[PDB]
Symmetry: D2
Subunit: 333 residues, 4 copies
């Protein structure tokens, strides 16, 4: 299988294409489904507010995109069951619309003639993969798999290293997170979520995330031991996750940091920095998560000890690089 | 005399319509609201405003209503206007603020649904179109559907009218540097067919079409076909400014243009004047439709060839709403 | 009827709102003098036009050496060094110190040398009486001459910590505040003292930032010295900020139980408010509280007998902090 | 030799100057940098850029130097240019990017400090002022202090040149909608005597004077006195756009203007062309001084009279910098 369809050519969907081409994958994107014309998807692909001009040629026809000389079909089917995946033989669907985050929903891509589905979001009780953490759990028999959220790919490698070195007995996270398409431009209805209805570029907005609640799926031993949430803020991309943990051993900052450095060495998914970076330095990062040793903090009072560890993430591109790693491997089995 | 109002589209404009009605202690009585959501969500949005802060009156809700300052207001959720039960509470004048009924053909559905008149908060083609204190004397008892044009029109028109009256505008072109609005996009993604509107509004200067100058003839007939213009949408949440570059009908100095504008703003509740070094946030919550800024006036001349740039600020949300309400209160007494 | 005469040093974001708040509440204090680094014209323009709070609610004019505010004169000086400020010329006896450059006993001493009697500093100023109104203002007496009101963050954190302490005990905790950007940061990438992160464009980044609010909490709640640490993340909102605290408390608790203890702590408490509405930061702008506890963000995380407790409070680091500074100033001035 | 360069002001422009020189593999050799801080801090700023991302070469520092791509650059901290020890490493041409030496009299100080020539990164009064590919042919061997004018001059000049050559410009006025810069304020507070410059830059539309139009005569002598203009500073970090409204010497169509402009941009490394529906973030990183935008051309005509609006984008940081470097590469070989 090296024949891929993208459902939802949005922020994540367009970067999936950018990244496959950046690394010369032997995967060919042959079809795209969205809700618009080829002309509009081409304008969007060619001109990116966050990452600049497309590095390759982009043109269109009435029913297709021409990207670096290759034709890619464009469909506009609102319901995934009606998508002609069979037409160009789309074998693996990268599902990035947000409207098919379950086994039962992404089932419709199978019923429309696809073999597998990789969902770019948490998708309930299914095999959920952070690359370089639990991707060894994938087999030939898997059809519909999830890569969880940007936050889950940030949190998990940091949690994994802490759990391996020290044990995490209990923990809570806060991610300070760039605003996304789920939020609003101006104050107005955004389904049931009251907070999501508020102008995203003019507010700090508390926001639910299951990254920590559903970490059980990626790190089985931490199942039900983490909770967390987000504060969405007015940066366009680039985020950071703080974890506060009661660990299984007394530790020093240097000790926590050395252990993290160890876990990041020749680790293409998980980086390290000892530099005084800010969110914009993470934009275009090729990691899922970059641990920041400068923000490590140990608060100790006797027996009791709280350990704050902080990792950066490019929630768009960084998360994507993880999505592509997982995709390449899903596609070889 | 016609005191009972329905609001269709309880959005940025619709919410502030109510805020401004209560602020001026109008005898107009908002009896019903229609939108696409629950009373709970509307009540949340009404209490809490990112641009203007906490609502100055109490806000609660029921399964089917808002309770604002102790007074009950019915809430309906009908997406097609012809199905709004305006008769239940005797809603007579509908303030149409959804963006989806911007023509006589479309807004007449409120009449079908049992209302008496419609005031549309946006341009709506070739119909009676009013900028208060510019052409509100053209209203009469036979007007049943009326437009107040756009924020931009309520800014430009009084500046243009003043220049028309004192000097003549032979030809001109407008550019408005305008706050982003809910028609734009939060992140890069499709936004109908307008390519530019697909781009992240808070992270970009975005060129944007607007008919304010194009359709000025509806408000000042003698300027019909003599102006063009466009917008540059920028990352401020509200507050905007309009520059007009004109060939006037007479040779002028900057001091002469400013005195003529000052005279037009004197005792004019719709049209302010300033020569303070203000910036956009100083216009947020303005009670004018337009505020002429004398500090930005510029005369460029070479022999007989003269270009005149005049500039006016406007709070495209609340300030425009003050005009909307002035127009509503007159409409209702006809 | 006590009419203390006040001078303001540093007519900045905080200094200006101090005057705004004093007139807003009709305080008996008269502000008789202001010192900054500029002309009365520039100070008048800034007082009149405010990007966060809108137009000044009172008339503002200037002469070559004064502001005229609602028809009252306020002398204007421009003395880089506080010892040269002529506070005696208009009888200014209580200086509200808001420049950032006199944050110690030894430095603010200069206001007394120059003829003032008391100084209240609008920031942490080391080992000195450090007041969060409605937490420890009863430590104030007639013998105090130089006092601090700590930071905005201390004024957010201390009431929430106080109530948790009083109700449950806190064994240990750690704080993160997601904080509006301020004048100590940069507009564009460029040198800002010695703090590398402060050099980066404030409106375009999440910027980690050290704050002493947790570390020095003991000056305000002595039982908690050494028990808390924390830091900030600076983000692109112009004002309005939120403080999270992750605590191990000395009792097992539920969320409801935590939220009820906080509610009771906020009852008839002019300094410390409560919400259970789904507010966001722009809803805190213009708050008349130093801190507003948010019941909606309370989180208990539990395994066996291990419980982590997250509590969260909003604050307008500008106006809200200023209401606290003014309460503290009214009491300080009457002693 | 004249291949050895010092940078005064290692700021937004100073650092991108070094970035650009390395990017085009110039045989210019930056031997010295002066600013007001430590090499630690300069190294941190060069390595990590909020607008352009990570520096593409290595950066380390010592107590008195930077090491950029393995090459040592001396760092001084002399707030008065007369005291900068340029002779120590033999800096002959100074790229003056502080903003504090924007006159012949002031930049003379670099020559008394032992340098041979100064290139000022801003307007600087009546001295030879260069927009590359408009009037770089005017530089000669004897010039010791020159200007590259502003970002806005580099954007306006080539558009005005093309219009001037093809149709004549009788008179015209300009408005640039311009990214905020370091002369503005993060929070409301004193900023010298420009009142508007004291207002929070990322929360306002802020009008602002610029000499781009007024001083155009230095770059295109025939347009001396024929243009005026100003800016509206808005909340984007870099990337700007310039609109010019002109009375031309001929009657024209939109297509005719667009084709003339397209001709002037053909094989022009300094002056780009687009007919794509771009927005400001699309110009960030541009290797042009100016990119004419055909999509925004507008002809407003009534009988005999005509106004023509033409629009060009520019990356006021990197794009302007690319013109500065073209000019410096010629300057160094005269
Ligand atoms: N942006 C992030 O930071 C981020 C990070 C990790 C994961 N994700 C996840 O990836 C998914 C996509 O997020 P995004 O940021 O790219 O969203 P987006 O809104 O930018 O993109 C959604 C795209 O899907 C299209 N679409 C919507 N409904 C559709 C349908 N029924 N059929 C076909 N196309 C449809 C839209 O037109 C749009 O192009 C979401 O599930 C999100 O939770 C997002
Ligand atoms: N925001 C401005 O600056 C501004 C200024 C002047 C005029 N206007 C005009 O006012 C109108 C409203 O603008 P807005 O900014 O308040 O938009 P908005 O998106 O904030 O509000 C639209 C509201 O109408 C609701 N709505 C959408 N479709 C509906 C339907 N079929 N039936 C009932 N409700 C529906 C939405 O749920 C929302 O509450 C538009 O025509 C706009 O052009 C806007
Ligand atoms: N969020 C907040 O802004 C906030 C909250 C709580 C406490 N504080 C504290 O209050 C103090 C002021 O903060 P700000 O935000 O008002 O700063 P600011 O920069 O807005 O104001 C400082 C003012 O002091 C002037 N100044 C500088 N040095 C001076 C000197 N030697 N003499 C006289 N005037 C001088 C400046 O011209 C400016 O007007 C700081 O100590 C700060 O930590 C700030
Ligand atoms: N940023 C733009 O958009 C832009 C575009 C075109 C031209 N310019 C011009 O280029 C020049 C620099 O602009 P910038 O945006 O890089 O400014 P900036 O504030 O980022 O850079 C100024 C640099 O000079 C240093 N400095 C200040 N005074 C000094 C002194 N006496 N001696 C040595 N160093 C000193 C500062 O520390 C800083 O590193 C200005 O003249 C400006 O007009 C700027
Ligand atoms: O731009 C982003 C999407 O619509 C939502 O992504 P999210 O699920 O990460 O909030
Ligand atoms: O949908 C939200 C706004 O109404 C759009 O306002 P606008 O029509 O002025 O762009
Ligand atoms: O100049 C001082 C700043 O305006 C205030 O910032 P701070 O509250 O971070 O100290
Ligand atoms: O600090 C200097 C500013 O960055 C320069 O830009 P400007 O002079 O074009 O405002
Ligand atoms: Cl037009
Ligand atoms: Cl517009
Ligand atoms: Cl600490
Ligand atoms: Cl001019
Ligand atoms: Cl400018």
């Amino acid at each position: 299988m090296s024949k891929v369809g993208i459902n939802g050519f949005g922020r994540i969907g367009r970067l999936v294409l950018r990244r496959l081409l950046e690394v010369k994958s032997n995967i060919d994107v042959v079809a795209i489904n969205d809700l618009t014309s080829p002309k509009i998807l081409a304008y969007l692909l060619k001109h990116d507010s966050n990452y600049g001009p497309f590095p390759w040629s982009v043109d269109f026809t009435e029913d297709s995109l021409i990207v670096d000389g290759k034709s890619i079909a464009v469909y506009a089917e609102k319901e995934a069951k009606n998508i002609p995946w069979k037409a160009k033989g789309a074998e693996i669907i990268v599902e990035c619309t947000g409207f098919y985050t379950s086994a039962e929903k992404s089932q419709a891509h199978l019923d429309a003639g696809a073999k597998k589905v990789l969902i770019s979001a948490p998708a309930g009780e299914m095999k959920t993969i952070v690359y370089n953490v639990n991707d060894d759990t994938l087999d030939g028999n898997d059809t519909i798999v999830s890569v969880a959220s940007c936050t889950t790919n940030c949190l998990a490698p940091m949690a994994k290293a802490l759990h391996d070195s020290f044990g995490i007995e209990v923990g809570t996270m806060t991610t300070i997170h760039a605003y996304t398409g789920t939020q609003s431009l101006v104050d107005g209805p955004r389904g049931k979520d009251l907070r999501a209805s508020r102008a995203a570029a003019e507010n700090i907005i508390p926001h639910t995330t299951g990254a920590a609640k559903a970490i059980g799926l990626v790190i089985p031993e931490l199942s039900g031991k983490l909770k967390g949430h987000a504060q969405r803020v007015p940066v366009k991309t680039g985020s950071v996750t703080e974890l506060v943990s009661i660990l299984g051993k007394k530790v020093t900052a240097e000790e926590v940091n050395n252990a993290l450095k160890q876990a990041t060495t020749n680790n293409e998914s998980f980086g390290y920095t000892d530099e005084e970076i800010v969110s914009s330095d993470i934009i275009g990062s090729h990691f899922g998560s970059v641990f920041d040793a400068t923000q490590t903090e140990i608060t100790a009072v006797g027996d009791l000890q709280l350990v704050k560890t902080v990792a950066w993430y490019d929630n768009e591109y960084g998360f994507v690089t993880q999505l592509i790693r997982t995709l390449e491997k899903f596609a070889k089995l």
